[PDB]
Amino acid sequence: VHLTPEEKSAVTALWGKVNVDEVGGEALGRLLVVYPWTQRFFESFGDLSTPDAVMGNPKVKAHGKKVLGAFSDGLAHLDNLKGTFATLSELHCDKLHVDPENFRLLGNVLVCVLAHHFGKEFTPPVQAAYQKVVAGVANALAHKYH
Amino acid sequence: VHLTPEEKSAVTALWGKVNVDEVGGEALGRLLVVYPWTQRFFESFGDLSTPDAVMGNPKVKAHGKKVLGAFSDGLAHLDNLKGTFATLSELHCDKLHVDPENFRLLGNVLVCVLAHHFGKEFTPPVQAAYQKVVAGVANALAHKYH
Amino acid sequence: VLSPADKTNVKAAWGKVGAHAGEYGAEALERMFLSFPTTKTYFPHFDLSHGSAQVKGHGKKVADALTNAVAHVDDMPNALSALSDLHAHKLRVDPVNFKLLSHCLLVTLAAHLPAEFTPAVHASLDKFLASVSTVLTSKYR
Amino acid sequence: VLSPADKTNVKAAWGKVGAHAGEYGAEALERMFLSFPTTKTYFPHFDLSHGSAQVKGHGKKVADALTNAVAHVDDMPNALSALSDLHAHKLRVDPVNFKLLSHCLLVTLAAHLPAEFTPAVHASLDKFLASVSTVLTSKYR
Numbered sequence: 255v256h257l258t259p260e261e262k263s264a265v266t267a268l269w270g271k272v273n274v275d276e277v278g279g280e281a282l283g284r285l286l287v288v289y290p291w292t293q294r295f296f297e298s299f300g301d302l303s304t305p306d307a308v309m310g311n312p313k314v315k316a317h318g319k320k321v322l323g324a325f326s327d328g329l330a331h332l333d334n335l336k337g338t339f340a341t342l343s344e345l346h347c348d349k350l351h352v353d354p355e356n357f358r359l360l361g362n363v364l365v366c367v368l369a370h371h372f373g374k375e376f377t378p379p380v381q382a383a384y385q386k387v388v389a390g391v392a393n394a395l396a397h398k399y400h
Numbered sequence: 401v402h403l404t405p406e407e408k409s410a411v412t413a414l415w416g417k418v419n420v421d422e423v424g425g426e427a428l429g430r431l432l433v434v435y436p437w438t439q440r441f442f443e444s445f446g447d448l449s450t451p452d453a454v455m456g457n458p459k460v461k462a463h464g465k466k467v468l469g470a471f472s473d474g475l476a477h478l479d480n481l482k483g484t485f486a487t488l489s490e491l492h493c494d495k496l497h498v499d500p501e502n503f504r505l506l507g508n509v510l511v512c513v514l515a516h517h518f519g520k521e522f523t524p525p526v527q528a529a530y531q532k533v534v535a536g537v538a539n540a541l542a543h544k545y546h
Numbered sequence: 547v548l549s550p551a552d553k554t555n556v557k558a559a560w561g562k563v564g565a566h567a568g569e570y571g572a573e574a575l576e577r578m579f580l581s582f583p584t585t586k587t588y589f590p591h592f593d594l595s596h597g598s599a600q601v602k603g604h605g606k607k608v609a610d611a612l613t614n615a616v617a618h619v620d621d622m623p624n625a626l627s628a629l630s631d632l633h634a635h636k637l638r639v640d641p642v643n644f645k646l647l648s649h650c651l652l653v654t655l656a657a658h659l660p661a662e663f664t665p666a667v668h669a670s671l672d673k674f675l676a677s678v679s680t681v682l683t684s685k686y687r
Numbered sequence: 688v689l690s691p692a693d694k695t696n697v698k699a700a701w702g703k704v705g706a707h708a709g710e711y712g713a714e715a716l717e718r719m720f721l722s723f724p725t726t727k728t729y730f731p732h733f734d735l736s737h738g739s740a741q742v743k744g745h746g747k748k749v750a751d752a753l754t755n756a757v758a759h760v761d762d763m764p765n766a767l768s769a770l771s772d773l774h775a776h777k778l779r780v781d782p783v784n785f786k787l788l789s790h791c792l793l794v795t796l797a798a799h800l801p802a803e804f805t806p807a808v809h810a811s812l813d814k815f816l817a818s819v820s821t822v823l824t825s826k827y828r
């Protein structure tokens with residue numbers, strides 16, 4: 255997408271401070287807590303039927319990891335998401351069947367989780383820049399949808 | 401945007417058939433009926449204060465032909481809706497102060513109006529095509545916004 | 547919050563449907579899958595080919611649930627409790643989709659009703675598919 | 688609906704909030720202006736530099752309204768009915784932008800309440816701002 259110099263720079267800098275596997279776990283799980291119909295893709299994973307259960311469910315937290323890790327990598331191709339994400343887009347349409355509304359729901363719980371993590375370091379300007387990033391990644395996920 | 405040429409024909413085909421005028425008054429009107437908070441922009445137009453009143457209001461009708469004329473316009477030029485609409489984009493930010501979300505609403509009302517007017521000629525496929533165009537054209541009008 | 551007017555409008559309209567309500571309800575799905583292709587992510591079991599039994603069948607079921615809402619218009623919550631459970635607990639369709647199919651259904655009325663789709667009819671039908679939508683999504687969280 | 692453990696949740700995160708209500712009102716709005724610029728269409732009469740006193744002032748007034756709907760959780764209808772006729776009849780803010788300002792107040796709360804912002808609380812406050820948004824847009828048509 256396009257962000258300024260100064261936009262890009264402020265993404266990159268927080269993210270250096272992020273433990274990708276803890277934040278991944280957290281955002282996954284609060285997805286599934288605050289928007290419980292997200293739960294539909296996940297009922298391999300075992301016991302979802304409380305907020306404590308969810309948050310301390312292993313399969314949750316691995317899956318979080320693995321989605322965040324991909325997002326991580328992504329932040330390093332922020333001139334080229336849609337090519338970055340093309341083949342995941344794919345996947346997630348034709349074999350996973352994930353309605354791309356969940357992408358956006360994850361991106362706004364990600365934002366809420368940065369803020370809780372960072373407190374007053376997650377300024378309004380820096381909010382703004384990750385909103386731009388989170389929207390880019392949704393829409394690049396969603397790009398191959400048919 | 402992205403048509404298919406079997407979608408670019410079914411759009412060009414039908415829109416040679418459109419009264420601008422007529423369809424344009426009808427689209428605007430219904431906007432204002434269905435979603436009355438839209439009438440926040442039009443308070444200089446006259447009494448809006450129930451259905452026959454909005455549909456037969458000559459200032460509705462007039463403006464309704466203005467916008468569908470410009471919509472017209474942009475059909476000639478498909479595959480660069482942003483560089484068509486960027487002036488008018490600017491305008492409805494900095495001068496008019498119109499929420500872009502009103503672009504989407506009229507798009508949907510337009511579809512409504514085509515279906516009512518054309519009957520069983522506005523098939524599913526044609527719809528689909530017209531959906532991509534109006535989404536296109538909303539998005540092109542919102543481009544300028546800051 | 548449905549006026550008396552609105553009721554009327556809506557009884558009327560869906561009256562005028564009749565017995566094509568199943569046919570209609572197919573063609574709204576059709577319209578939805580072609581125009582808003584995301585919505586197909588909730589039906590990877592179906593064959594969504596033009597003319598699909600499966601869609602025709604589903605579409606009947608939708609229709610009938612709407613005919614039941616019109617019967618009922620003063621106590622929709624009731625009447626549509628099980629399919630609110632269903633969609634909450636079970637199908638777990640994202641609430642943005644509800645919009646999508648309600649516009650498709652408008653679209654299909656418009657196409658079939660050249661007389662009875664007047665402005666005022668349009669507005670009550672939109673408010674009424676909104677309040678259907680709100681009931682079906684009430685127990686999600 | 689809010690359960691009654693939602694209510695607990697909201698009453699004892701907002702009582703947290705206490706006497707910063709305003710300032711946090713204020714930051715929410717800034718957040719929304721910067722992150723979603725189309726909302727600024729409804730403020731073209733404000734100075735929207737940051738720390739204006741118009742923003743200030745409006746943030747207070749947004750947070751005392753929310754303060755009044757947490758006092759009256761069980762009948763926020765009747766509690767909000769002033770400002771629902773205002774936003775229906777006057778202000779006419781398209782309903783989408785109520786999710787954008789709900790977003791940014793959840794972000795603000797999360798930013799300032801690191802102990803009380805659990806999952807379970809997230810969830811309840813998300814719910815609570817969705818309901819205040821529906822009771823604000825209630826009289827719109």
Ligand code: HEM
Pocket residue numbers: 292295296320321322324325342346350352356357360391395
């Ligand atoms: C930032 C947004 C996301 C990113 C980058 C992402 C990325 C990925 C990656 C890298 C995989 C593994 C793919 C290999 O299996 O190939 C995957 C699988 C998965 N994702 Fe996504 N994903 C995202 C959001 C979602 C969301 C929001 C849901 C649903 C709520 C979702 C549901 C799944 C499922 C069910 C699979 C299969 C898991 C295996 O089968 O265990 N993903 N995702």
Ligand code: HEM
Pocket residue numbers: 438441442444463466467468470471488492496498502503506541
């Ligand atoms: C299809 C999308 C649209 C197109 C192409 C479009 C086009 C235009 C054009 C050509 C004009 C005259 C412009 C002075 O002439 O330089 C205009 C103005 C006007 N439009 Fe838009 N318009 C769009 C949709 C909308 C919507 C949905 C709203 C709000 C509901 C809107 C509200 C305005 C208003 C308030 C003006 C000024 C009216 C006279 O000046 O009071 N437009 N538009």
Ligand code: HEM
Pocket residue numbers: 585588589604607608611612629632633637639643644647678679682
């Ligand atoms: C007016 C709005 C809606 C009405 C009235 C309604 C009604 C129904 C009925 C009556 C069923 C059958 C429940 C017998 O199975 O019980 C159903 C099933 C289902 N619904 Fe909904 N529905 C609505 C919207 C939606 C939307 C928007 C989606 C997705 C885009 C969705 C996806 C489905 C799925 C996936 C099924 C299962 C289909 C089986 O597999 O056959 N529904 N709905």
Ligand code: HEM
Pocket residue numbers: 726729730745748749752753770773774778780784785788789819820823
């Ligand atoms: C949580 C939801 C919201 C709450 C509780 C609420 C609250 C309020 C209150 C208390 C007032 C002052 C009314 C004392 O004048 O009469 C007002 C006015 C104002 N509201 Fe809402 N508000 C909400 C959301 C929105 C949203 C989303 C926007 C637009 C993006 C908006 C735009 C406005 C504007 C333009 C005014 C007039 C302000 C100047 O003129 O003062 N509001 N709001």
